[PDB]
Protein backbone atom coordinates (compact mmCIF):
# COMPACT_ATOMS: atom_id res chain seq x y z
CA UNK A 1 0.00 0.00 0.00
CA UNK A 2 2.18 2.84 -1.32
CA UNK A 3 -0.67 5.26 -2.03
CA UNK A 4 -0.34 8.40 0.10
CA UNK A 5 -2.95 11.06 0.94
CA UNK A 6 -1.78 14.48 -0.33
CA UNK A 7 -2.89 16.06 2.94
CA UNK A 8 -0.20 14.09 4.80
CA UNK A 9 2.42 15.89 2.73
CA UNK A 10 3.81 19.36 3.32
CA UNK A 11 5.90 20.71 0.46
CA UNK A 12 9.03 22.74 1.34
CA UNK A 13 12.00 24.35 -0.44
CA UNK A 14 13.26 23.04 -3.78
CA UNK A 15 16.33 20.78 -3.55
CA UNK A 16 17.08 19.94 -7.21
CA UNK A 17 15.60 19.23 -10.64
CA UNK A 18 14.75 16.06 -12.56
CA UNK A 19 13.84 15.20 -16.16
CA UNK A 20 10.16 15.22 -15.10
CA UNK A 21 10.03 18.17 -12.66
CA UNK A 22 11.37 19.81 -9.51
CA UNK A 23 12.46 17.93 -6.42
CA UNK A 24 11.32 19.33 -3.10
CA UNK A 25 12.05 18.58 0.50
CA UNK A 26 9.02 18.31 2.79
CA UNK A 27 7.37 16.60 5.72
CA UNK A 28 5.24 13.46 5.82
CA UNK A 29 2.77 13.68 8.65
CA UNK A 30 1.00 10.87 10.45
CA UNK A 31 -1.22 10.55 13.47
CA UNK A 32 0.98 9.82 16.51
CA UNK A 33 4.00 9.92 15.29
CA UNK A 34 5.99 13.04 14.67
CA UNK A 35 6.81 13.89 11.17
CA UNK A 36 9.10 12.36 8.64
CA UNK A 37 11.52 14.27 6.44
CA UNK A 38 11.03 13.31 2.80
CA UNK A 39 12.09 14.16 -0.73
CA UNK A 40 9.16 14.88 -3.03
CA UNK A 41 9.63 14.31 -6.74
CA UNK A 42 7.24 16.38 -8.86
CA UNK A 43 6.19 16.32 -12.49
CA UNK A 44 5.64 19.36 -14.77
CA UNK A 45 4.08 17.50 -17.73
CA UNK A 46 2.38 14.60 -15.88
CA UNK A 47 -0.74 15.98 -17.57
CA UNK A 48 -0.18 13.44 -20.40
CA UNK A 49 -0.49 9.71 -19.71
CA UNK A 50 2.72 8.63 -21.44
CA UNK A 51 4.77 10.96 -19.21
CA UNK A 52 2.93 9.72 -16.09
CA UNK A 53 3.83 6.05 -16.76
CA UNK A 54 7.47 7.03 -17.40
CA UNK A 55 7.59 9.04 -14.16
CA UNK A 56 5.97 6.33 -12.04
CA UNK A 57 8.18 3.55 -13.43
CA UNK A 58 10.89 5.35 -11.42
CA UNK A 59 8.92 4.74 -8.22
CA UNK A 60 8.52 1.09 -9.25
CA UNK A 61 12.28 0.75 -9.71
CA UNK A 62 13.11 1.97 -6.17
CA UNK A 63 10.37 -0.21 -4.67
CA UNK A 64 12.37 -3.27 -5.80
CA UNK A 65 15.15 -2.38 -3.33
CA UNK A 66 15.42 -2.55 0.45
CA UNK A 67 18.92 -1.56 1.64
CA UNK A 68 20.28 0.75 4.37
CA UNK A 69 22.56 2.54 1.88
CA UNK A 70 20.06 3.02 -0.96
CA UNK A 71 17.35 5.65 -0.72
CA UNK A 72 13.94 4.16 0.16
CA UNK A 73 10.65 4.72 -1.61
CA UNK A 74 8.05 5.93 0.90
CA UNK A 75 5.07 6.24 -1.45
CA UNK A 76 3.24 7.79 -4.38
CA UNK A 77 0.37 10.23 -4.90
CA UNK A 78 -1.36 9.20 -8.11
CA UNK A 79 -3.76 12.09 -8.70
CA UNK A 80 -2.54 15.26 -10.43
CA UNK A 81 0.02 16.54 -9.72
CA UNK A 82 1.55 13.04 -9.43
CA UNK A 83 4.18 12.83 -6.65
CA UNK A 84 6.83 10.33 -5.62
CA UNK A 85 7.81 10.55 -2.00
CA UNK A 86 11.32 9.34 -1.18
CA UNK A 87 13.19 9.34 2.13
CA UNK A 88 15.25 12.50 2.67
CA UNK A 89 18.98 12.68 2.95
CA UNK A 90 19.04 15.85 5.03
CA UNK A 91 22.71 16.78 4.54
CA UNK A 92 22.49 16.80 0.72
CA UNK A 93 24.79 15.72 -2.10
CA UNK A 94 28.13 14.07 -1.30
CA UNK A 95 30.17 16.48 -3.50
CA UNK A 96 29.05 19.70 -1.77
CA UNK A 97 29.53 18.07 1.62
CA UNK A 98 33.16 17.03 0.90
CA UNK A 99 34.06 20.48 -0.45
CA UNK A 100 32.58 22.29 2.56
CA UNK A 101 33.69 19.87 5.32
CA UNK A 102 37.14 19.48 3.72
CA UNK A 103 38.80 20.31 7.06
CA UNK A 104 36.66 18.38 9.51
CA UNK A 105 36.57 15.03 7.71
CA UNK A 106 39.36 12.59 8.57
CA UNK A 107 40.50 10.05 5.98
CA UNK A 108 38.54 7.45 8.01
CA UNK A 109 35.19 9.05 7.07
CA UNK A 110 35.90 9.13 3.34
CA UNK A 111 36.71 5.39 3.41
CA UNK A 112 33.49 4.76 5.35
CA UNK A 113 31.51 6.36 2.50
CA UNK A 114 33.31 4.26 -0.13
CA UNK A 115 32.62 1.10 1.91
CA UNK A 116 28.93 1.92 2.59
CA UNK A 117 28.32 2.55 -1.11
CA UNK A 118 30.11 -0.70 -2.02
CA UNK A 119 27.78 -2.65 0.27
CA UNK A 120 24.86 -1.08 -1.63
CA UNK A 121 26.49 -1.89 -4.96
CA UNK A 122 27.14 -5.48 -3.89
CA UNK A 123 23.42 -5.71 -3.09
CA UNK A 124 22.50 -4.42 -6.55
CA UNK A 125 25.06 -6.83 -8.07
CA UNK A 126 23.50 -9.83 -6.24
CA UNK A 127 20.15 -8.75 -7.70
CA UNK A 128 21.86 -8.34 -11.10
CA UNK A 129 20.84 -4.71 -11.36
CA UNK A 130 23.20 -2.57 -13.39
CA UNK A 131 23.22 1.01 -12.12
CA UNK A 132 25.05 2.64 -15.08
CA UNK A 133 25.28 6.02 -13.32
CA UNK A 134 27.58 5.62 -10.32
CA UNK A 135 29.15 9.02 -9.66
CA UNK A 136 29.52 11.22 -6.54
CA UNK A 137 26.87 13.64 -7.87
CA UNK A 138 24.51 10.68 -7.31
CA UNK A 139 25.53 9.91 -3.73
CA UNK A 140 23.61 11.58 -0.88
CA UNK A 141 24.44 12.20 2.77
CA UNK A 142 21.96 11.22 5.50
CA UNK A 143 24.31 12.01 8.33
CA UNK A 144 28.02 12.35 9.05
CA UNK A 145 28.51 8.60 9.14
CA UNK A 146 25.94 7.68 6.48
CA UNK A 147 25.88 8.07 2.70
CA UNK A 148 23.26 6.61 0.36
CA UNK A 149 22.79 6.27 -3.39
CA UNK A 150 20.09 8.71 -4.44
CA UNK A 151 17.08 7.99 -6.61
CA UNK A 152 18.21 6.17 -9.79
CA UNK A 153 15.56 8.15 -11.66
CA UNK A 154 17.43 11.40 -10.88
CA UNK A 155 20.88 10.05 -11.78
CA UNK A 156 26.43 10.29 -21.29
CA UNK A 157 28.86 10.54 -18.31
CA UNK A 158 31.89 9.82 -20.54
CA UNK A 159 34.47 10.66 -17.84
CA UNK A 160 32.88 8.07 -15.50
CA UNK A 161 32.24 5.27 -18.02
CA UNK A 162 34.17 2.02 -18.64
CA UNK A 163 35.79 1.63 -22.10
CA UNK A 164 33.39 -1.10 -23.29
CA UNK A 165 30.42 1.06 -22.33
CA UNK A 166 31.85 3.96 -24.35
CA UNK A 167 32.93 1.88 -27.35
CA UNK A 168 30.19 -0.77 -27.39
CA UNK A 169 27.37 0.48 -25.11
CA UNK A 170 27.86 -2.69 -23.04
CA UNK A 171 26.74 -1.73 -19.55
CA UNK A 172 27.28 -4.49 -16.97
CA UNK A 173 28.29 -4.85 -13.29
CA UNK A 174 31.96 -4.87 -14.23
CA UNK A 175 31.32 -1.52 -15.95
CA UNK A 176 29.64 -0.33 -12.73
CA UNK A 177 32.84 -1.36 -10.88
CA UNK A 178 34.87 1.00 -13.10
CA UNK A 179 32.37 3.79 -12.40
CA UNK A 180 32.64 3.02 -8.69
CA UNK A 181 36.42 3.28 -9.06
CA UNK A 182 36.01 6.82 -10.45
CA UNK A 183 33.63 7.57 -7.55
CA UNK A 184 36.06 6.42 -4.84
CA UNK A 185 38.53 8.82 -6.49
CA UNK A 186 36.07 11.74 -6.33
CA UNK A 187 35.52 11.00 -2.62
CA UNK A 188 39.23 10.88 -1.78
CA UNK A 189 39.68 14.06 -3.83
CA UNK A 190 37.00 15.81 -1.71
CA UNK A 191 34.55 16.24 -4.56
CA UNK A 192 36.82 17.15 -7.48
CA UNK A 193 35.63 15.97 -10.90
CA UNK A 194 37.66 13.55 -13.10
CA UNK A 195 39.40 14.95 -16.18
CA UNK A 196 39.03 18.69 -15.52
CA UNK A 197 39.35 20.82 -18.68
CA UNK A 198 39.47 17.65 -20.80
CA UNK A 199 36.83 17.48 -23.58
CA UNK A 200 34.70 14.30 -23.63
CA UNK A 201 36.36 13.22 -26.92
CA UNK A 202 39.91 13.29 -25.51
CA UNK A 203 38.83 10.96 -22.67
CA UNK A 204 38.70 7.59 -24.46
CA UNK A 205 42.00 7.93 -26.38
CA UNK A 206 43.71 8.60 -23.05
CA UNK A 207 42.06 5.57 -21.37
CA UNK A 208 43.27 3.36 -24.24
CA UNK A 209 46.73 4.94 -23.96
CA UNK A 210 46.73 3.61 -20.38
CA UNK A 211 46.24 6.90 -18.53
CA UNK A 212 44.37 6.51 -15.25
CA UNK A 213 43.36 9.09 -12.65
CA UNK A 214 46.33 9.97 -10.34
CA UNK A 215 46.71 8.83 -6.72
CA UNK A 216 45.03 11.48 -4.54
CA UNK A 217 47.29 13.13 -1.96
CA UNK A 218 47.18 11.19 1.36
CA UNK A 219 45.36 8.22 -0.26
CA UNK A 220 46.69 5.01 1.35
CA UNK A 221 48.66 2.90 -1.20
CA UNK A 222 46.43 -0.20 -0.80
CA UNK A 223 43.26 1.80 -1.59
CA UNK A 224 44.73 3.21 -4.81
CA UNK A 225 45.84 -0.28 -5.81
CA UNK A 226 42.16 -1.22 -5.46
CA UNK A 227 41.11 1.76 -7.59
CA UNK A 228 43.57 0.72 -10.33
CA UNK A 229 42.08 -2.78 -10.25
CA UNK A 230 38.65 -1.24 -10.84
CA UNK A 231 40.21 0.33 -13.96
CA UNK A 232 41.53 -2.87 -15.55
CA UNK A 233 40.84 -2.33 -19.26
CA UNK A 234 39.60 -5.90 -19.61
CA UNK A 235 36.45 -5.96 -17.41
CA UNK A 236 36.94 -9.62 -16.37
CA UNK A 237 40.10 -8.71 -14.41
CA UNK A 238 38.18 -6.07 -12.45
CA UNK A 239 37.16 -7.22 -8.95
CA UNK A 240 33.47 -7.88 -8.21
CA UNK A 241 31.57 -5.65 -5.78
CA UNK A 242 31.60 -8.31 -3.08
CA UNK A 243 35.42 -8.36 -3.36
CA UNK A 244 35.58 -4.55 -3.02
CA UNK A 245 33.34 -4.72 0.08
CA UNK A 246 35.72 -7.10 1.88
CA UNK A 247 38.78 -5.04 0.91
CA UNK A 248 37.26 -1.67 1.88
CA UNK A 249 36.25 -3.26 5.19
CA UNK A 250 39.84 -4.16 6.12
CA UNK A 251 41.24 -0.91 4.66
CA UNK A 252 38.79 1.09 6.83
CA UNK A 253 39.53 -0.82 10.06
CA UNK A 254 43.24 -0.20 9.37
CA UNK A 255 42.51 3.55 9.21
CA UNK A 256 40.15 3.65 12.21
CA UNK A 257 43.37 2.60 13.96
CA UNK A 258 45.58 5.18 12.13
C1 LIG B 1 18.27 18.65 2.05
O1 LIG B 1 17.96 17.48 1.25
C2 LIG B 1 18.64 17.58 0.08
C3 LIG B 1 19.06 18.82 -0.41
C4 LIG B 1 19.76 18.91 -1.60
C5 LIG B 1 20.03 17.75 -2.32
C6 LIG B 1 19.62 16.51 -1.83
C7 LIG B 1 18.91 16.41 -0.64
N1 LIG B 1 18.49 15.24 -0.15
C8 LIG B 1 17.87 14.31 -0.87
N2 LIG B 1 17.36 13.25 -0.25
C9 LIG B 1 16.74 12.30 -0.93
C10 LIG B 1 16.62 12.38 -2.32
CL1 LIG B 1 15.80 11.12 -3.19
C11 LIG B 1 17.16 13.49 -2.97
N3 LIG B 1 17.09 13.63 -4.31
C12 LIG B 1 18.02 14.33 -4.99
C13 LIG B 1 18.02 15.71 -4.87
C14 LIG B 1 18.96 16.48 -5.55
C15 LIG B 1 19.92 15.89 -6.37
N4 LIG B 1 20.86 16.74 -7.02
C16 LIG B 1 21.75 16.27 -8.12
C17 LIG B 1 22.92 17.26 -8.24
C18 LIG B 1 22.39 18.66 -8.66
N5 LIG B 1 23.45 19.71 -8.77
C19 LIG B 1 24.67 19.48 -7.94
C20 LIG B 1 25.72 20.62 -8.26
C21 LIG B 1 25.08 21.78 -9.03
C22 LIG B 1 24.44 21.30 -10.36
C23 LIG B 1 23.86 19.85 -10.19
C24 LIG B 1 21.23 19.13 -7.74
C25 LIG B 1 20.96 18.17 -6.56
C26 LIG B 1 19.92 14.50 -6.49
C27 LIG B 1 18.98 13.71 -5.82
C28 LIG B 1 19.24 12.38 -6.16
O2 LIG B 1 18.60 11.41 -5.75
N6 LIG B 1 20.27 12.26 -6.98
C29 LIG B 1 20.79 10.98 -7.50
C30 LIG B 1 20.83 13.57 -7.31
N7 LIG B 1 17.77 14.42 -2.21
Residue numbers in the entry: 414 to 568, 584 to 686
Article, verbatim:
Focal Adhesion Kinase (FAK) is a non-receptor tyrosine kinase that regulates signals involved in cell proliferation, migration and survival. FAK activation is initiated by breaking an intramolecular autoinhibitory interaction between the N-terminal FERM (4.1, ezrin, radixin, moesin homology) and kinase domains. All compounds exhibit a common 5-chloro-2-ortho-methoxyanilino-4-anilinopyrimidine core structure, which binds in a nearly identical manner to the hinge region of the FAK kinase.
The structures reveal that the carbonyl in the carbamoyl moiety of TAE226 and an analogous carbonyl in 2 of the 3 other compounds stabilize an unusual helical conformation of the DFG motif. The carbonyl within the isoindoline moieties of TAF089 and TAF672 superimpose well with the carbonyl in TAE226 and induce a similar helical turn at the DFG motif. The morpholine (TAE226), methylpiperazine (TAF089), dipiperidine (TAF672) or methylaminopyrrolidine (AZW592) moieties in para position to the amine groups of the aniline rings make almost no protein contacts, consistent with their incorporation for improved pharmacokinetic properties of the respective compounds. IC50 values for TAF672 could not be reliably determined because of its low solubility in DMSO and aqueous buffers, however, it can be expected to mirror the potency of TAF089 since the moiety that interacts with the FAK kinase is identical for both inhibitors.
